[PDB]
Write a protein that binds this ligand. Structure first.
Ligand SMILES: *[C@@H]1O[C@H](CO)[C@@H](O[C@@H]2O[C@H](CO)[C@@H](O[C@@H]3O[C@H](CO[C@H]4O[C@H](CO)[C@@H](O)[C@H](O)[C@@H]4O)[C@@H](O)[C@H](O)[C@@H]3O)[C@H](O)[C@H]2NC(C)=O)[C@H](O)[C@H]1NC(C)=O
Ligand SMILES: *[C@@H]1O[C@H](CO)[C@@H](O[C@@H]2O[C@H](CO)[C@@H](O[C@@H]3O[C@H](CO[C@H]4O[C@H](CO)[C@@H](O)[C@H](O)[C@@H]4O)[C@@H](O)[C@H](O)[C@@H]3O)[C@H](O)[C@H]2NC(C)=O)[C@H](O)[C@H]1NC(C)=O
Ligand SMILES: *[C@@H]1O[C@H](CO)[C@@H](O[C@@H]2O[C@H](CO)[C@@H](O[C@@H]3O[C@H](CO[C@H]4O[C@H](CO)[C@@H](O)[C@H](O)[C@@H]4O)[C@@H](O)[C@H](O)[C@@H]3O)[C@H](O)[C@H]2NC(C)=O)[C@H](O)[C@H]1NC(C)=O
Ligand SMILES: NC[C@H]1CC[C@H](NC(=O)[C@@H]2[C@@H]3C[C@@H]4C[C@H]2C[C@@](c2ccccc2)(C4)C3)CC1
Ligand SMILES: NC[C@H]1CC[C@H](NC(=O)[C@@H]2[C@@H]3C[C@@H]4C[C@H]2C[C@@](c2ccccc2)(C4)C3)CC1
Ligand SMILES: NC[C@H]1CC[C@H](NC(=O)[C@@H]2[C@@H]3C[C@@H]4C[C@H]2C[C@@](c2ccccc2)(C4)C3)CC1
Ligand SMILES: *[C@@H]1O[C@H](CO)[C@@H](O)[C@H](O)[C@H]1NC(C)=O
Ligand SMILES: *[C@@H]1O[C@H](CO)[C@@H](O)[C@H](O)[C@H]1NC(C)=O
Ligand SMILES: *[C@@H]1O[C@H](CO)[C@@H](O)[C@H](O)[C@H]1NC(C)=O
Ligand SMILES: *[C@@H]1O[C@H](CO)[C@@H](O)[C@H](O)[C@H]1NC(C)=O
Ligand SMILES: *[C@@H]1O[C@H](CO)[C@@H](O)[C@H](O)[C@H]1NC(C)=O
Ligand SMILES: *[C@@H]1O[C@H](CO)[C@@H](O)[C@H](O)[C@H]1NC(C)=O
Ligand SMILES: *[C@@H]1O[C@H](CO)[C@@H](O)[C@H](O)[C@H]1NC(C)=O
Ligand SMILES: *[C@@H]1O[C@H](CO)[C@@H](O)[C@H](O)[C@H]1NC(C)=O
Ligand SMILES: *[C@@H]1O[C@H](CO)[C@@H](O)[C@H](O)[C@H]1NC(C)=O
Ligand SMILES: *[C@@H]1O[C@H](CO)[C@@H](O)[C@H](O)[C@H]1NC(C)=O
Ligand SMILES: *[C@@H]1O[C@H](CO)[C@@H](O)[C@H](O)[C@H]1NC(C)=O
Ligand SMILES: *[C@@H]1O[C@H](CO)[C@@H](O)[C@H](O)[C@H]1NC(C)=O
Lengths: 125, 237, 125, 237, 125, 237
């Protein structure tokens, strides 16, 4: 469904912070003993409102809260780290959790290149 | 049920759980991301009087924590040390592994008292308290947070901080009184219209014009002199 | 394998309690500050012994205990929340963890509708 | 190795790990469910004397907890406050986030003493102690539980509670003695054949016929007057 | 990429310890109350350096440390148990996270036996 | 980014994240395994003086723990009780669920003092401290560990222990002094070249030749008399 930013204002620029697990650190900076303290593990970036994605994202996070709050109410887990992995599993189950009926709308198997393969073999024969 | 953001047709949208888009490609868990967005960015008032009225105490509801991976640099964060009049703490110590929000232009540190009529302090609008890559439903003692909300997405394939100290009475009620602290004996009656920048200029001109308390007593000054950030009493005039 | 209830008795009715994460709450009841206390998050239901499923389930939970206990003995995790997600992953790996040989018994790809597609194209040509 | 229940041919069965059923459809993790079933429902005796003999103390085994999502309304649950004769606690405080079993017709609260010859109390038959959507291998102090076991399944695509208090000596041994508590000074010698309903009628007729202790001393009464639930001493007769 | 043991020495034999979740215990030894203490849950085995796998593994664990350390620095989770499950999910996403174009290099669908099926039907017709 | 070991062509290799091998088969999560390998097995010196120089104290870095499923029987493990000169502990108590490394031929137990100039003790080369199926970035008080590193793999489809006690001063610095403890009053100056087997023979010949302290004072002996394991002062000579 579409996302309609209904907030009183929108900061159109997202100055963000995150971590980089990939690291590929210089020399020995990956060793915990030598590496950065907790304050210095962050990278930063700036994203502008191309395609209205920043105001869309602010609205999306707003609209996510209810379902996220209802999920946290129902879990007995104190700290939840598994939401994205479970979404990855559900991505796969939606496509591959049953028999894949080729040409059917719920089956993401593309037989095009092989149809042209069998077709050229038939033209020969 | 938890919405997942996805980009179609140059537009962010919520993924239809009932409609399979075979064109969508998820080639690793790295394409999935969780983001915390600050209430600030939606236009909410961020002065201490306005912000604290959004929080309240409640018993019977276990706290909950969810992680997020990327966050937004905040102009305003808050850090609370609230006790009851009898000196018992109102807020729990931060659990192991919960650190303060990492990017705050202004940390509003509020000390004082209230009746604290509940076991934990929650956001009355349902938002989260964002800490270091962990969002909580409750406020932890002495720990810097930003008010925010979390989104989940499938992507397509220097730093200066300043602490502003305040004192509070009747915290968490209708009749909360706030003072901005210049030193341990000089305070300014806090109004909602005072911006962080104004408070820092007010502090500096008090220090330089010698209007700090030169007694052992407590000096309190009063002052009577639509735009978002990204765009012994007395008187002074 | 079949499930043979070997218990001395069986309560044939299951009066159960659970949570509803879907929620879709009325007004503001999803906000933790306003919503129910811990005692009031539960829904309830009643299931009878159609197809012998309740007595089967009692026997199944009984028979599950040994393997579940041996699993908990071997994990160093204090509280285990991942059993169902791991079963979902293993469901997918059993079917898709290798090359899918079409027509082979271990490949859940149904080419029927497309066989009739190629067949009608051949009848034309 | 952990069995998974699945419905084939109008019958619940254990899924064959060695046999792939391509007809089986799992379209989301929501179809997977974990359920806790009460030992009650299999016909086990639920009176306090019979139930406690199923539990025992053991050292050297770390406790373990697993979650479950749906449970069964219990007729009988238990809640234990056991100390050694020297007053030290026998059971650990409930860990953070472990609450009592949510649906109990009768909570049998047992206070008293035993030798408690081990670090934790386990179920001698291998069953679990079911709490609020968390099943544990051990008993926690002062926390209501039901005895039960957990199943895992792939689905196809008011409340009244009453606390009954008891006192115990020699808890967890061969020669355990139990008293049913009417008030802090009136008790009834407990027999295995006494049902919860009988104990509640016994309590009410003692209160109304004035057979409670009207001294400072402890009055103990004795009493001598195959069906599952879903289908200063003296004497009384 | 290949694994080149660059350590000063290599113990070519791996005397290892682990647990067995499968258990299939004798009588009642699966019951926690009766079963082994924490010290007695371990099995053992001995593996020699056939195909150079032991020295390879020592080098592999050495070379893993940097990426593993950078991962642990970036997680807020105190104890990480999910690395192997996430690798299983990523195994599936790499193969099935998009449309499977048959005959394409990124699609592990083998149509050989069915190509010979359609072929024999064409020889008949 | 975390390397995954896989066997191709009779050779262990790192899986190419950019290259899909459709021939590779993963039929369950059981084929995935995590293994802890001991630094011992790479040829590092394992005497207490050499091993402790690999560890150091650091503040500002939160500890982290990752699990592993199979480990290697160790010849050398270590167990540290270190205090500051003022008696405060240098190392944290083991968290709940972290037990000592399960297979150690020799446990080197080191008690003593150092300045401990940091909140946690880390491995200066980036390795882990391996405990019972949990690898930590830091050292826990009084808990046996082996130095090691973790690998992740996709597989194709009696026990004797001996504790050796030492005393230390200046632990964690350049000028650390170590004594091997024969009894509470008899010690031997520790040198790097002393093997565990030598220390145990040294202990036994001191006990049998009566060279233990027969006073209330502390007797300290000195001694002056390329191969891996798998292949009141005085003097003695
Ligand atoms: C997601 O975005 C929504 C829209 O921005 C947020 O909606 C807010 O919801 C709360 C209730 O939880 C409302 O609070 C009520 O406000 C009235 C006062 O009237 C106010 O209404 C106007 C809007 O027409 C608002 O802009 C003014 O400031 C007025 O003061 C009180 O009487 C109630 O008791 C209650 O406090 C907010 O008004 C409402 N905001 C807006 C802009 O509509 C929603 O909270 C967001 N969700 C999360 C989780 O952050
Ligand atoms: C799964 O269901 C099984 C069947 O209901 C449960 O089996 C129980 O297993 C325990 C051992 O762990 C047995 O306890 C022993 O009992 C004898 C006493 O004889 C009893 O045997 C009859 C059955 O012929 C029983 O119905 C009577 O009440 C007798 O008193 C003692 O000598 C032993 O020391 C030990 O206590 C149970 O007898 C047995 N029950 C049944 C009905 O067979 C099993 O525990 C369940 N698993 C879980 C995890 O709950
Ligand atoms: C993975 O394996 C690598 C190779 O075995 C390990 O490399 C070690 O890395 C540390 C730095 O973190 C080095 O320590 C430095 O050593 C010098 C002293 O010179 C030493 O160099 C030779 C090698 O030519 C070594 O064999 C001798 O013992 C010498 O004493 C100091 O000046 C530095 O300050 C620092 O301490 C090690 O020398 C190096 N070992 C080897 C054999 O190259 C690496 O640590 C392993 N990774 C993990 C996580 O265990
Ligand atoms: N490994 C280094 C990189 C790892 C990925 C990191 N991206 C994020 O967190 C992402 C990107 C940057 C930022 C925070 C999130 C979401 C985001 C976005 C906004 C609106 C619509 C869609 C997406 C905005 C894209 C940037 C560092
Ligand atoms: N989102 C609202 C709903 C979510 C699903 C909930 N079902 C359960 O827990 C299920 C259903 C109800 C109850 C508890 C479990 C297992 C069960 C069953 C019994 C015997 C054989 C097979 C299955 C019995 C089906 C009911 C509320
Ligand atoms: N369920 C009982 C069994 C479960 C699997 C257990 N294997 C392990 O841990 C494995 C096997 C034994 C040992 C420890 C790990 C990795 C290993 C290896 C070494 C070099 C290259 C490749 C692999 C070496 C194979 C053995 C007990
Ligand atoms: C707070 O609001 C007014 C004062 O502003 C007061 O009259 C009222 O009784 C108070 N209400 C509550 C709920 O405390
Ligand atoms: C002000 O008081 C606080 C505590 O009351 C104290 O920590 C701080 O050092 C004081 N500042 C000065 C300048 O005395
Ligand atoms: C107020 O001004 C004084 C004088 O320069 C300064 O030292 C102090 O840090 C200021 N306070 C704040 C909150 O900026
Ligand atoms: C002393 O404090 C007064 C206020 O009581 C302030 O106005 C004045 O500046 C201070 N004294 C001097 C000499 O500045
Ligand atoms: C308990 O049982 C009897 C008393 O009923 C007693 O003779 C026996 O020694 C006791 N056994 C144990 C193991 O305590
Ligand atoms: C009975 O005693 C308990 C503690 O011994 C106490 O909490 C309770 O209030 C007492 N009840 C009465 C009626 O005195
Ligand atoms: C026993 O009877 C009295 C008198 O009605 C009542 O107050 C009390 O709660 C009863 N006890 C129980 C356990 O029902
Ligand atoms: C006083 O207690 C006695 C038992 O000692 C009981 O039988 C009697 O009912 C009580 N007194 C009255 C007047 O009921
Ligand atoms: C330790 O090393 C030498 C003594 O061996 C000493 O001179 C030096 O100052 C010390 N260095 C540090 C960093 O403590
Ligand atoms: C040696 O001293 C330790 C503590 O200082 C003590 O625990 C131990 O029992 C003593 N050993 C002897 C033989 O006295
Ligand atoms: C040292 O020798 C004595 C005498 O046999 C023995 O009791 C003691 O355990 C030995 N110490 C060690 C560390 O082996
Ligand atoms: C008493 O201790 C001395 C060292 O002071 C040692 O050489 C001697 O063996 C001991 N006495 C006897 C009789 O052995």
């Amino acid at each position: 469904e579409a996302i309609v930013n209904a907030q009183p204002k929108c900061n159109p620029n997202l100055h963000y912070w995150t971590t980089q697990d990939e690291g590929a650190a210089i020399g020995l900076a990956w060793i915990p003993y030598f590496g950065p303290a907790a304050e210095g593990i962050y990278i930063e970036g700036l994203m502008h409102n191309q395609d209205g994605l920043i105001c869309g994202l602010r609205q999306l996070a707003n609209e996510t809260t209810q379902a996220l709050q209802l999920f946290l109410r129902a879990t007995t887990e104190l700290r939840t780290f598994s939401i994205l992995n479970r979404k990855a599993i559900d991505f796969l189950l939606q496509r591959w959790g049953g028999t894949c009926h080729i040409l059917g709308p719920d089956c993401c198997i593309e037989p095009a290149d092989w149809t042209k393969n069998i077709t050229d073999k038939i033209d020969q024969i | 049920s938890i919405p997942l953001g996805v980009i179609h047709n140059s537009a962010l949208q919520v993924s239809d759980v009932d409609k399979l888009v075979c064109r969508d490609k998820l080639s690793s868990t790295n394409q999935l991301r969780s983001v915390g967005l600050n209430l600030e960015g939606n236009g909410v008032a961020t002065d201490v009087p306005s912000a604290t009225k959004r929080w309240g105490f409640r018993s019977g509801v276990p706290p909950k924590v969810v992680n997020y991976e990327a966050g937004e640099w905040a102009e305003n964060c808050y850090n609370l040390e609230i006790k009851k009049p009898d000196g018992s703490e109102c807020l729990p110590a931060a659990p192991d592994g919960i650190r303060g929000f990492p990017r705050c232009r202004y940390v509003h540190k509020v000390s004082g008292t209230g009746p604290c009529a509940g076991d934990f302090a929650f956001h009355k609008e349902g938002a989260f308290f964002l800490y270091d890559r962990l969002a909580s439903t409750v406020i932890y003692r002495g720990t810097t947070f930003a008010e925010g909300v979390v989104a989940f997405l499938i992507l397509p394939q220097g730093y200066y901080s300043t602490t502003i100290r305040y004192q509070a009475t009747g915290f968490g009620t209708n009749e909360t009184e706030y003072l901005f602290e210049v030193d341990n004996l000089t305070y300014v009656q806090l109004e909602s219209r005072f911006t962080p920048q104004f408070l820092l200029q007010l502090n500096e001109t008090i220090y330089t014009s010698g209007k700090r308390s030169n007694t052992t007593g407590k000096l309190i000054w009063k002052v009577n002199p639509e735009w978002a950030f990204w765009e012994x009493x007395x008187x002074x005039x």
